């Protein structure tokens, strides 16, 4: 059994450009990392969702999104695109020393 974390991105898509939506959409889905025995489910949630996250930046040049949990802005998640079946997720704290390596997640 793996641990499954939900990430519900909260945003009004009617206010985004098509390019912005395309870039967020690269990260939607069910993802897993074998070594960590961890899965993540990244979805477009809303105000009814638990596990809500606010997008800080959508980098359409580099296919990266940054986001944080609504009330815990000390931990920034950064997702990078690898291919249709792989994304990278980094969890970072401004207050820490060093780099947490991004972790490769494969699509389920």
Among candidates 78, 84, 63, 67, which has minimal Cα distance to 19?
63
Contacts of 46 (CB under 8 A, 6+ apart): 8, 10
Residue 6 token pair: 């939900």
3-state secondary structure of 67: strand
Of 65, 80, 54, the residue nearest 20 (C-alpha): 65
The parent domain of residue 95 ranges over: 2-108
Q: How was this structure determined?
A: X-ray
Q: CA torsion 100→7→95→57, rounded to 10°?
A: 90
| Beta pairing, strands 38-44 & 3-9 | parallel
Place of tokens 């997720």: 89
Number of domains in the chain: 1
How far apart are alpha carbons 72 and 98 in whole angstroms?
20
The CATH code of the domain that includes 50 is 2.40.310.10
């Amino acid at each position: 059994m793996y641990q499954l974390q939900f990430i519900n991105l909260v945003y009004d898509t009617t206010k985004l450009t098509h390019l912005e939506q395309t870039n967020i959409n690269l990260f939607m889905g069910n993802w897993s990392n074998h070594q960590l025995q961890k899965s993540i489910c990244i979805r477009h949630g809303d105000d009814t969702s638990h596990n809500q996250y606010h997008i800080l930046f959508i980098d359409t040049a580099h296919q990266r999104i940054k986001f944080s949990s609504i009330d815990n802005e000390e931990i920034i998640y950064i997702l990078d695109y690898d291919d249709t079946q792989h994304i990278l997720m980094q969890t970072s704290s401004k207050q820490g020393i060093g780099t947490s390596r991004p972790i490769v997640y494969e699509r389920l």
